[PDB]
Amino acid sequence: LKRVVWALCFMGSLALLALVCTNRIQYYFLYPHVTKLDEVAATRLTFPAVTFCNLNEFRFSRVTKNDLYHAGELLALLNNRYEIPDTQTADEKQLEILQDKANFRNFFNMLEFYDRAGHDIREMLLSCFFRGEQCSPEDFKVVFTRYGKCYTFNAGQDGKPRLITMKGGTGNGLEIMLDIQQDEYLPVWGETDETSFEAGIKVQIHSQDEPPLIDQLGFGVAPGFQTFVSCQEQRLIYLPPPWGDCKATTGDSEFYDTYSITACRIDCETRYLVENCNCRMVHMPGDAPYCTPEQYKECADPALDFLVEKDNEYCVCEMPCNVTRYGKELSMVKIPSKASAKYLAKKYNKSEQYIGENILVLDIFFEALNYETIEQKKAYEVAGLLGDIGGQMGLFIGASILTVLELFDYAYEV
Amino acid sequence: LKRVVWALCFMGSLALLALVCTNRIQYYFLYPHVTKLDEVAATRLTFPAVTFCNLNEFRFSRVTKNDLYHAGELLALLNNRYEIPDTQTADEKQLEILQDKANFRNFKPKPFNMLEFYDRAGHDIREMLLSCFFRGEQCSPEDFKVVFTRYGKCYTFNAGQDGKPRLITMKGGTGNGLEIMLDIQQDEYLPVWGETDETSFEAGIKVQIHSQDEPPLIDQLGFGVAPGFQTFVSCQEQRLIYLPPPWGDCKATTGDSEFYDTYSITACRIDCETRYLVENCNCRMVHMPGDAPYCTPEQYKECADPALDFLVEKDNEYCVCEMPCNVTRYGKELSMVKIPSKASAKYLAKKYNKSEQYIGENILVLDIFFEALNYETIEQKKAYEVAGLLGDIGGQMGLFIGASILTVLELFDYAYEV
Amino acid sequence: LKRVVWALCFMGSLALLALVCTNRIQYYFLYPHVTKLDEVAATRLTFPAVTFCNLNEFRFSRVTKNDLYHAGELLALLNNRYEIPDTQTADEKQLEILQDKANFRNFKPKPFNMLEFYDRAGHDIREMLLSCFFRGEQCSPEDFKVVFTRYGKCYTFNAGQDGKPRLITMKGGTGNGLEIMLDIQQDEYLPVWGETDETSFEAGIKVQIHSQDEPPLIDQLGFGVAPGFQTFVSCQEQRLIYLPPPWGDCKATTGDSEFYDTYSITACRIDCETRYLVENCNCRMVHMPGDAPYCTPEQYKECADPALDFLVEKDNEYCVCEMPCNVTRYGKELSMVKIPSKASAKYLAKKYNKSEQYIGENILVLDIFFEALNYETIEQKKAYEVAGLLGDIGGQMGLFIGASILTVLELFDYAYE
Ligand SMILES: *[C@@H]1O[C@H](CO)[C@@H](O[C@@H]2O[C@H](CO)[C@@H](O)[C@H](O)[C@H]2NC(C)=O)[C@H](O)[C@H]1NC(C)=O
Ligand SMILES: *[C@@H]1O[C@H](CO)[C@@H](O)[C@H](O)[C@H]1NC(C)=O
Ligand SMILES: *[C@@H]1O[C@H](CO)[C@@H](O)[C@H](O)[C@H]1NC(C)=O
Ligand SMILES: *[C@@H]1O[C@H](CO)[C@@H](O)[C@H](O)[C@H]1NC(C)=O
Ligand SMILES: *[C@@H]1O[C@H](CO)[C@@H](O)[C@H](O)[C@H]1NC(C)=O
Ligand SMILES: [Ba+2]
Ligand SMILES: [Cl-]
Ligand SMILES: [Cl-]
Ligand SMILES: [Cl-]
């Protein structure tokens, strides 16, 4: 009777060992991870790259008759028949100018047009200060995006050293006073695809390793306010397969030195436009030929829109394992104060109304001298699995790997 | 002498096995969990439900003499004695209109209902909605569903209720989302001539982005949007998975309420309020769902409001709402630009037959979108399972004395024989 | 032949046991942690402390002839030669006041104190606070406690100091929190007639929401609020628990500061600054606490500012502040509505005896509240404790060779012979 209960105990015990052991086996083969949050204090933080565009693509005073002829339909100033839109709510001077530029009696490169006709940082930048020291417009690098001629501070490209800040708070960062030049905005007399009612700027704070994608990743800043942007640096570490989904091999594209999800997106877009239309848009990089305004209308735009809708699987961009992101909180104060409106108006030779409708101050800084780290960490390593299987194997039947080998011997002999 | 060193080694080893084993056992009965954060890319994201209210509860031009009679004291337009309060800063025309509506001489009171009053006197979306765009294509006011909240007649875009299928977005960024130009109609706001608790100085709208599975709770979970700016809202979809007891505190059971199909903490709160008011005052407020009779303004004054305040103050034990295990939250970042530009002010004023002053002080543009086509997942994960517990106890039990459950069974064998 | 294959199995098994065992040992000695996020519903929340400053440091109408004499150069009202700068784009009356105040002819100076000057010249809460409400009941200016910061005379609601009990809120949403209507008094702002480093063009207030256990740090940790809007601030209470060494880097000890009862990273920062300024310049600025003598504007000019700037870069290793293990933080989301409505603009103008222009450029309403009655917890949790190490080592030690600590002790016993 004792040997019978002993045998049943060995059978049931081996069953428990079976289900527990297979439990840990399957759990290990889920390849699970868990998240580790940490906050790291530092004596220094590398200041990010800040790209901003004016919401107005190009200045009205810099457009010429040839530009109206070639790109008049694309810029939405002229119709398909090369005629002025509805004369409702048209400035007399503006309408006379446009009719004169559209004489088209006895009368082009897209990047020339954007580079020359776009808003000049030398006129927009009323003041610049970085860590309390003056900066020049030469510090901003020209980048061409969907919004037109845009500028990036602390771009760190072409070998320029990335800036550091050794103090946190509103004073110790980038601080620019900009004039959005609302008088240069395209007159809107009729509904158009490009028609916009907004006035202000659009900003993206990003690491120097990734290109700007300001039409998607940007936030707005309105004139008449000083907006503060508190940034918090975040360092993210992901896991490759089979744990997570990250790109272990960087596989950097020829266009950009460092791989980024954004750079992969605009690379896919450029390649698609080159394949379908044999030309590239203004924002796209490389040495490829730029599109003509006729090419824009009949090929480029429908190809991009069709690329978004028709085949979303075609452009699959994996996320890199090391990603530096910047968190940001916005707040505003009124500019200018009643005590300062007169001095600004006289300093920049403008009316007090103009200052009210055209001046914005951007204040970008790190809240404190620290950065957060978010790391995906493996939850079950092979040592832990062998340890658990060994522990349960020794608790339930007390066997070992040598024991199973010896059982194969005794079974083999008999 | 060797048997003494063996006895000491076995005793100390058995003690260490005791405290370490009880350590791992107690850790298991804490039922600990740790968090797994992940970011998942998707080719499509279901666009959320967007509820917005005007900060002004009802339009001044739509209020009638009967409304002043029944709900005049509640609407704060008339005093307790059915007479107009202090006329400070009163436009002659507006004050004459109100004085005419409050004549109450040989007046036969018509029947009055709170939901009728809010439904007709509230701001009409057909008048507020100057333009709507979703994914670059036009939307109708028919996409907006009428929802009654504490703020009055409010509207929910993409509510996904009453059999309408929920909208999706296949691209991220400012263009590819909801974008509505609204006229808040500041001319219809109730005149404020005397100070009161209900008096407010704000002008604009209030918006809540929420899942279609939960009803709006705009008085608590909404953010404000001011006229004169285009406000961008970047959203990040978050999928949360919690653990039930004894690991965490979540609602494991579906717990369907009579009022709402899917369980949500918001639905649990407004359900608790509805039940409390129905039992205490035998009437229901405007925002509450069900089939109960709505309160009369007398019931509002003498029962409903003090009943809700007393429910909030006396004890939270009556309404204890646990969070469901599967929760979809939407994160949002706000930014602003000025509207309209000088190049557009005249065109807007002429397009909607208003003065440029009016456009400047009444037009707001709301742009709601997903920053990118991905969603975050936050999952509570169990940290110590019974297989791992048995593995650790077996490992240490085998390390210190090298015994097994069969070994302890044999020692109990000799104990039974003894 | 059987003993040879057995020997190969025992050798490979002992090698694998070696590398796996050293693996778990090294993983334990990394002292790793992982994070536990949780959300807890609550019936009550302790309302935080709210500090706000006017962006204008001191009122122009309260500055006196003696103040101009001693601190005229420091306040940027007077030039290096104690003379008014260029009068370009200066209102005739506005400049007349200053020219009369800066006469300095047959003027017999009187004693001067920087903290008296800020306390008397700063914006008075009794004039700024147009209305106050907490949980729907009225509050007085006496509820705000005076704190001196780099921005000047500032105020803290629900400071919980001097024996006052901390306030709680039992409901979430816009109504059920602090709600103040403020007049920033833009007419009292310092005139800006000439370019200077100290010149600023902003108008408004700056707010910091913080725990009562920490002093404000508004020059670094504050956000702005603009006039002409009601700004809603939704707060989310976060409770954080960190690990001390060797797992993480937190304050294991109480860390008693001389100036503050409770330790906070901010209190550590202003402590480092105050001590440094007392050692190098023998005086403290207005914002600094303690019992040292306050600096004179000459001391400010020739010692204090360059000493602080030298402290930032040269001694960046010198001020190291460790983070406390238990920290209550408040997260915030900002949104705005327009104030006043056309239906209320004139009523406000007559209620406060001001023009509608003034109301438009001077009135702001701040609405601070909890989004919901819950709090998040973020805890660093030890990932590998010694019990788990011993369990894993025993499991693998028993799987590969089937040995125990008694087995190795017996092997050393036989080796002893
Ligand atoms: C909560 O969400 C999870 C998925 O995130 C649901 O789990 C799925 O349940 C269905 C059954 O209806 C299975 O077919 C799927 O395979 C499950 N997915 C996973 C990943 O396990 C879960 O059912 C949801 N819970 C509730 C109450 O809705
Ligand atoms: C990624 O970043 C971490 C710091 O966050 C660094 O230690 C590591 O070397 C980087 N590279 C890789 C491949 O992890
Ligand atoms: C100042 O503005 C006026 C008005 O346009 C202009 O005529 C004048 O040239 C400007 N002065 C300078 C120095 O540019
Ligand atoms: C514009 O509105 C006013 C207000 O009543 C009306 O009198 C006028 O006829 C309207 N104009 C047009 C063109 O509809
Ligand atoms: C209102 O202010 C004016 C000056 O602006 C003053 O003359 C008048 O006495 C004030 N009235 C009251 C009641 O304070
Ligand atoms: Ba020195
Ligand atoms: Cl998992
Ligand atoms: Cl736990
Ligand atoms: Cl580690």
Residue numbers in the entry:
A (entry chain C): 42 to 148, 153 to 459
B (entry chain B): 42 to 459
C (entry chain A): 42 to 458
Per the authors:
Acid sensing ion channels (ASICs) are voltage-insensitive and proton-gated members of the epithelial sodium channel/degenerin (ENaC/DEG) superfamily of ion channels that assemble as homo- or heterotrimeric sodium-selective ion channels and are expressed throughout vertebrate central and peripheral nervous systems. ASICs exhibit a simple three-state gating scheme, populating a non-conducting resting state at high pH, opening upon exposure to protons and quickly desensitizing, recovering proton-sensitivity only upon return to high pH. The homotrimeric splice variant ASIC1a is highly enriched in the central nervous system (CNS) and participates in numerous physiological processes including learning and memory and nociception. ASIC1a activity is modulated by endogenous divalent cations including Zn2+, Mg2+, and Ca2+ and the modification of ASIC1a gating by extracellular Ca2+ has been an area of active investigation.
